[PDB]
Amino acid sequence: LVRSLSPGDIVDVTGIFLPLLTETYLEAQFVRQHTSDVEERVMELITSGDVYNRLAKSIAPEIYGNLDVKKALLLLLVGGVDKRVGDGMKIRGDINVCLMGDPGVAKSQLLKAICKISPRGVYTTGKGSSGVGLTAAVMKDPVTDEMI
Amino acid sequence: DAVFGDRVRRFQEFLDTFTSYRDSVRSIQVYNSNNANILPHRIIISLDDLREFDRSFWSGILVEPAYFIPPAEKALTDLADSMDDVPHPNASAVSSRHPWKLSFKGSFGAHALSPRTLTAQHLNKLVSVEGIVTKTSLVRPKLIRSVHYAAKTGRFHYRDYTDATTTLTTRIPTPAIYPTEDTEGNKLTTEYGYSTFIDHQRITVQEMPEMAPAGQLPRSIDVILDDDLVDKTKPGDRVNVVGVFKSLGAGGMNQTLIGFKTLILGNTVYPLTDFDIRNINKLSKKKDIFDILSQSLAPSIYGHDHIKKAILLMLMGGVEKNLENGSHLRGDINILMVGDPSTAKSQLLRFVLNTASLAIATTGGLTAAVTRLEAGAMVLADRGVVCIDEFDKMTDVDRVAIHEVMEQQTVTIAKAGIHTTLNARCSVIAAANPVFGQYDVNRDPHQNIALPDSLLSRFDLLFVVTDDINEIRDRSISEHVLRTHVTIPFLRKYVQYAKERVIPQLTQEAINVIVKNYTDLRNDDNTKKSPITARTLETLIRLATAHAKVRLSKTVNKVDAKVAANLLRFALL
Amino acid sequence: DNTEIIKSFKNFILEFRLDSQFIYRDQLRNNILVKNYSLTVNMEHLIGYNEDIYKKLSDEPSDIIPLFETAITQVAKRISILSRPTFQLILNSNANQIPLRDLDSEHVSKIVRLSGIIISTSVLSSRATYLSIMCRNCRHTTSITTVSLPRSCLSCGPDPYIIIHESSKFIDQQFLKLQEIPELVPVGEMPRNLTMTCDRYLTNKVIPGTRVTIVGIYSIYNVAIRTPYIKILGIQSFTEEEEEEFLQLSRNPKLYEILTNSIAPSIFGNEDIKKAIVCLLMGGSKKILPDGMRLRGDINVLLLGDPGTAKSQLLKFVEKVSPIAVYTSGKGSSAAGLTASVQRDPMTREFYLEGGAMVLADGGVVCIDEFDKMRDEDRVAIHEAMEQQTISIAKAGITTVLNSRTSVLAAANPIYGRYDDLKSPGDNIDFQTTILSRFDMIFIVKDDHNEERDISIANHVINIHTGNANAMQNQQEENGSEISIEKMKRYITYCRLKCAPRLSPQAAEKLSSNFVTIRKQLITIRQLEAIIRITESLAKLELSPIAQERHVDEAIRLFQASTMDA
Amino acid sequence: VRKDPITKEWTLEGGALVLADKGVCLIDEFDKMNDQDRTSIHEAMEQQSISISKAGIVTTLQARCSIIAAANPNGGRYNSTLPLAQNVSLTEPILSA
Ligand SMILES: Nc1ncnc2c1ncn2[C@@H]1O[C@H](COP(=O)(O)OP(=O)(O)O)[C@@H](O)[C@H]1O
Ligand SMILES: Nc1ncnc2c1ncn2[C@@H]1O[C@H](COP(=O)(O)OP(=O)(O)O)[C@@H](O)[C@H]1O
Numbered sequence A: 001l002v003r004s005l006s007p008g009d010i011v012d013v014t015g016i017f018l019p020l021l022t023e024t025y026l027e028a029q030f031v032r033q034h035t036s037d038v039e040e041r042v043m044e045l046i047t048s049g050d051v052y053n054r055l056a057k058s059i060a061p062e063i064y065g066n067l068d069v070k071k072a073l074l075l076l077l078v079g080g081v082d083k084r085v086g087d088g089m090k091i092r093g094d095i096n097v098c099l100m101g102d103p104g105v106a107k108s109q110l111l112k113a114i115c116k117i118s119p120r121g122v123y124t125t126g127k128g129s130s131g132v133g134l135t136a137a138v139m140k141d142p143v144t145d146e147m148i
Numbered sequence B: 001d002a003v004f005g006d007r008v009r010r011f012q013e014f015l016d017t018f019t020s021y022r023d024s025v026r027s028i029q030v031y032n033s034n035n036a037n038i039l040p041h042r043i044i045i046s047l048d049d050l051r052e053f054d055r056s057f058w059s060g061i062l063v064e065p066a067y068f069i070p071p072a073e074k075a076l077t078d079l080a081d082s083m084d085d086v087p088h089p090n091a092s093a094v095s096s097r098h099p100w101k102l103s104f105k106g107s108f109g110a111h112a113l114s115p116r117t118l119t120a121q122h123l124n125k126l127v128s129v130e131g132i133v134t135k136t137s138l139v140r141p142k143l144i145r146s147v148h149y150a151a152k153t154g155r156f157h158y159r160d161y162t163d164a165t166t167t168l169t170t171r172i173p174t175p176a177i178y179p180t181e182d183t184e185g186n187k188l189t190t191e192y193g194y195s196t197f198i199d200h201q202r203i204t205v206q207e208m209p210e211m212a213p214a215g216q217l218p219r220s221i222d223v224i225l226d227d228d229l230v231d232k233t234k235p236g237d238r239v240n241v242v243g244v245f246k247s248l249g250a251g252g253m254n255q256t257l258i259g260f261k262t263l264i265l266g267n268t269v270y271p272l273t274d275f276d277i278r279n280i281n282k283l284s285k286k287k288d289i290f291d292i293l294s295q296s297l298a299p300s301i302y303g304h305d306h307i308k309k310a311i312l313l314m315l316m317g318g319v320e321k322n323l324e325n326g327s328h329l330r331g332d333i334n335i336l337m338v339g340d341p342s343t344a345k346s347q348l349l350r351f352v353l354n355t356a357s358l359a360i361a362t363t364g365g366l367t368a369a370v371t372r373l374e375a376g377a378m379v380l381a382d383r384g385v386v387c388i389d390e391f392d393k394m395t396d397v398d399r400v401a402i403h404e405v406m407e408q409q410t411v412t413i414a415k416a417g418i419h420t421t422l423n424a425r426c427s428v429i430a431a432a433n434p435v436f437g438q439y440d441v442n443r444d445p446h447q448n449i450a451l452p453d454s455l456l457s458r459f460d461l462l463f464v465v466t467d468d469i470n471e472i473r474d475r476s477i478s479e480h481v482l483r484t485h486v487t488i489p490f491l492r493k494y495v496q497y498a499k500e501r502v503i504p505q506l507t508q509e510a511i512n513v514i515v516k517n518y519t520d521l522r523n524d525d526n527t528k529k530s531p532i533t534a535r536t537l538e539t540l541i542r543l544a545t546a547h548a549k550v551r552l553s554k555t556v557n558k559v560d561a562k563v564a565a566n567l568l569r570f571a572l573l
Numbered sequence C: 001d002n003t004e005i006i007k008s009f010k011n012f013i014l015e016f017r018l019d020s021q022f023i024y025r026d027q028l029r030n031n032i033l034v035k036n037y038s039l040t041v042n043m044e045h046l047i048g049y050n051e052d053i054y055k056k057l058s059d060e061p062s063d064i065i066p067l068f069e070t071a072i073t074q075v076a077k078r079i080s081i082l083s084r085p086t087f088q089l090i091l092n093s094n095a096n097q098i099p100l101r102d103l104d105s106e107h108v109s110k111i112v113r114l115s116g117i118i119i120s121t122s123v124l125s126s127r128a129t130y131l132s133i134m135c136r137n138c139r140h141t142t143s144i145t146t147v148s149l150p151r152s153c154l155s156c157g158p159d160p161y162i163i164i165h166e167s168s169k170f171i172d173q174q175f176l177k178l179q180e181i182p183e184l185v186p187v188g189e190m191p192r193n194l195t196m197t198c199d200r201y202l203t204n205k206v207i208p209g210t211r212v213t214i215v216g217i218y219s220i221y222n223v224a225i226r227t228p229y230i231k232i233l234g235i236q237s238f239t240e241e242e243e244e245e246f247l248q249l250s251r252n253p254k255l256y257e258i259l260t261n262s263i264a265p266s267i268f269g270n271e272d273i274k275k276a277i278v279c280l281l282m283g284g285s286k287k288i289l290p291d292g293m294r295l296r297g298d299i300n301v302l303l304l305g306d307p308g309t310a311k312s313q314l315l316k317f318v319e320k321v322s323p324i325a326v327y328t329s330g331k332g333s334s335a336a337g338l339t340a341s342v343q344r345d346p347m348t349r350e351f352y353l354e355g356g357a358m359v360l361a362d363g364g365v366v367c368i369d370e371f372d373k374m375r376d377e378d379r380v381a382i383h384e385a386m387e388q389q390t391i392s393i394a395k396a397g398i399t400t401v402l403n404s405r406t407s408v409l410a411a412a413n414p415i416y417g418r419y420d421d422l423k424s425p426g427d428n429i430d431f432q433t434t435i436l437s438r439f440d441m442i443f444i445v446k447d448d449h450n451e452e453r454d455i456s457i458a459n460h461v462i463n464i465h466t467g468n469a470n471a472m473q474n475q476q477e478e479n480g481s482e483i484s485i486e487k488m489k490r491y492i493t494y495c496r497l498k499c500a501p502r503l504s505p506q507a508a509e510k511l512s513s514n515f516v517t518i519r520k521q522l523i524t525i526r527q528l529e530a531i532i533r534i535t536e537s538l539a540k541l542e543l544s545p546i547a548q549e550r551h552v553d554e555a556i557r558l559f560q561a562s563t564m565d566a
Numbered sequence D: 001v002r003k004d005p006i007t008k009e010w011t012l013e014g015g016a017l018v019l020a021d022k023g024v025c026l027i028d029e030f031d032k033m034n035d036q037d038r039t040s041i042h043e044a045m046e047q048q049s050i051s052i053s054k055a056g057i058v059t060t061l062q063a064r065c066s067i068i069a070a071a072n073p074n075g076g077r078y079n080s081t082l083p084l085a086q087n088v089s090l091t092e093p094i095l096s097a
């Protein structure tokens, strides 16, 4: 089973939980990456047929008069197509949106709503939570001298 | 010993005479039967009931826990395994293994103590400790009973492991390497899946700085958490812990400063008058209630009535609003004061620390930096009010990171590695002085204090106070000082009563005036201390709700909006 | 044989009488009612009852004073019977406290009496007094009351015993550091610091910076390195003719001028500077309002001086006159950064809270030299201490607040070579203007060129270089121009302890008129308190029950000579 | 500071100023050193002694030395039209020594 997992993956791992305080670990047995039970819920919305406006009005139901902005958020949540051009080339299939505005226009509540809705959303303020909070760094392990 | 059985019988008699404990166990068993998640094997016993039934057993537990609690543990475990059939054969041999733990509650009398009031005379006894949790360690399981199996014989033999860190009485040292052969010499098999384990964690409870005496080093106690209550509080939580204050190791008796390692074997965790009510409610019926509580805010300080009114409203606070969508709404009110010195800026700032139920006074570290990450000054401010002096001295990082705390009332850690969200439900009051030595009324506060409008405007009320060179101000401001050459405890009870027992709600009648005034403010083009935005509308709701806290009413009325609008205009004109 | 010793102490406690009360038995009975197991015994009464038991205690206290502790435990047990743990004995003595420089090998293990100031205190630690042990081999159980466990069973192999924790008793221990009084510190000598340990209820009775009297057991424990220490047995912390002498002196009308001239007679001029220093030494008054506002009675003065204006001498003289004074220069303080600190003493391996210079001077005065060249972060603690009289120290997970009710005498060098009258002091003095806003009164000592002043100063230099300055001291004393430095120090402590004046309504309205007229011409409300402190300072010097309007004129003038000087 | 196994307490070893006691201490290029290094020299000439609190050692040593210092003006040339107090970074209190 070696060389199955990779760093940063989201997986469900099945195994045995094995051990005067005892130390515990898990012996991996089966690994998988990330349906009628939810197809019924999906069927209801497409049955109504209200797709763009309903979902664009669904995000932040407590913010006034930002339907055009919410529509851009709705597409950004969905995203485009990450076209693998081939021949070693690559074109991003994601949407980046900037929200300039005066103070008191609720342009930060949308930031909270986007992080809440998205399964992989991260909320950040200030100078990217400083330079150490932004980007990333390699840190040495004092136990094994390894850097992670 | 024979006396051990008699002590067990007393707890059995205790359970018989108080049906509440055993019927609760039966209710738990029925709940477990319906699920055949499983509830843990712990119940809570009131000490007052034990004291009223058997003082000696109650006193015996407090004074000699190692000689009185295990008899109670055996009595409860025996009753649990005998009250019903436990019909399932395979499940009974594993689920019923767990001994039934006990928890204590009630009045502790002389043993109701603190990390400082606790002394060595109370060691080897059961005590209740109240303090603040500073840090915790990783949860790890403790080996309790192992099961051995020989392949050639096909039968099971079990072995127990006990140590003084979890056992109430000092037993003979059990631990050793895991055995490999049985009595017959047959090679044994290690059955990992049939061994019984109990989770264990140690926490460090400390005396709060709120109550610590000045100039003396702190007192702290180590608390052990086991089994089900192994994780009940996070660092910073005000906790009440009951356990056996017990020593460990040796004080150098075998083989100089080394003392006996005194710590508490925690078994229970609880996170933290009528005449006063008859006085708080009674005194609110007069027509001028609000002015009374504004005068009692540092009465020796003359003038500044509106800022005292604003501070009182900040103490009362609004209501944070949550929705089924998962939204959270700001409910705290922030105030900032600006102008020339010698105007009691730090005096009222100091007074707030002397009045609030919880307050933190610091100066411009604010956020959690890096690993457990240390709790910053603004992080420790949850459910409290913050008093920051020299507010101009904030660094660039502090100035850009305070935005989330000011509005969202949340602290977000986004440092390399660990990411988490921490509650920052705090109201912030601060003061600042001009950089150039003197304030210039001909220029806006942004041009004087040098803090950006994007930071200054975040405060709901911005007060600019300057001592005029007029003689009439100088006469009163000096005479009031020279004149020095409803009670405050009642006021603090009023704040305690109002912030908890009454939650006002909105009403369309108040909306009729609040929206109208905000519409006028947006329409009015006259210069003001801040450009009007939607934030003022939220401020009016908070101020009206804060006034409703003073009036002690669940609804909102016209006068609540009238006062809120009038004061807001004062801070703007 | 030892039973007679136990009986003798039993009769001593039960039968000694003072003020018609059995004081030692009564106070032990009161302690039992309070439920604290402590007793205090005065040595001067021990010798009176019987010299034999006193002599035995003084000569071999190693085993006899355990007997006294056990005997009183029996006495307390007997007392409890009539009303139907090991008690502690505390020794107090009034005999002379031999200087710490004088203890020798002949006093080893003997009862000694010392005095000093507590500079540091450590954290508490657990110590054993009663134990129960069990053999791991044959399960033999017994009890034990540097004690060590038996190496062989008393019923099993070497070291068969283990400790039963749930059947044992323990006591609390604290380690402390003490050094000699500054009044006896030799010049060019580091004061003798001393290691002191106390146990049970003697712990946590003092804080660093406290002057105390010590009665204890001087002893030494372990090429042959040895370290002394004291086992603390007890800690303790004006004549009628002198009281009436100063009372008569209070009625002297020329006392203000006489005291002014006595302030550094070797210096020329600067007469009003001398008056300010007297007001600094006298200090104001502190009062507490019911709303939680505490009024600072301390007065702080800054002496902005040009180089060569004897600024070093001005602060140097004050330290020997003020009863509670410490000198600081170049960020140097009492082995700290002018504030409290937590340090680990390797001798006991424990962590100790250590008091800085501003900590030791609680209720006194501190002299700060080279004020313009100190660490800025130290100024912040000073700034809080200068106004709130508190110092805040944070260590790991604990923050502590320490009291510092100290008046500050400060001297500083201007930004340029000399103060320029064309500019505000905030642009002339070489440190933070925020601190400049905190001093009650600042003065600029001047160097105006004058013939007779310079010539008199010039001759004074040759007199020192010729040794005639020693004869000048006799000449000045014969002239009666100075009060004795020891007597003046006694007077400062006398007035600080006996008098606490209050302002009169006439003085208050006079101050109000002065303040209004000053601002009509123009000074902050903060400096109104600074002026008022001077009004209380003058009344305290005269020991008048209340301040008087006649104090206002000098108070206004001295402050006018300070603020309008810049 | 040096360790000593014979007595096990920290021992102190003197620097250049302690060596030149009853002698002369020469400081070439006096201006180029930092103010923290220069602050020690100032208190050396004033008190003729060294005061130090390091590694738990608090003591004073004799530093009776004479000083001869060479320096350079700002910019490497002396400004004849400005005073000495405005030709070097050396502060005036140190010049008075
Ligand atoms: N149209 C709107 N609907 C709902 N809330 C609003 C609206 N406009 C403003 N608000 C309120 O005002 C605040 C806007 O602040 P924020 O989102 O931080 O804007 P900015 O980024 O300009 O500071 C929010 O707390 C929000 O509750
Ligand atoms: N209205 C007032 N009533 C009484 N005292 C006042 C008033 N205004 C200012 N003061 C006095 O002025 C002093 C200035 O304190 P403060 O202005 O808080 O300091 P800072 O200007 O450094 O913040 C205080 O000690 C206070 O006693």
Ligand SMILES: Nc1ncnc2c1ncn2[C@@H]1O[C@H](COP(=O)(O)OP(=O)(O)O)[C@@H](O)[C@H]1O
Pocket (backbone or CB within 6 Å): C266, C267, C268, C269, C306, C307, C308, C309, C310, C311, C312, C313, C457, C460
């Ligand atoms: N009014 C005065 N009375 C007596 N001595 C004076 C007077 N003015 C100056 N002096 C002499 O001038 C010297 C000043 O040196 P000092 O001020 O201590 O140096 P620094 O300014 O570096 O501290 C002293 O030695 C002192 O004897």
Ligand SMILES: [Zn+2]
Pocket (backbone or CB within 6 Å): C135, C136, C137, C138, C139, C140, C153, C154, C155, C156, C160
């Ligand atoms: Zn034995």
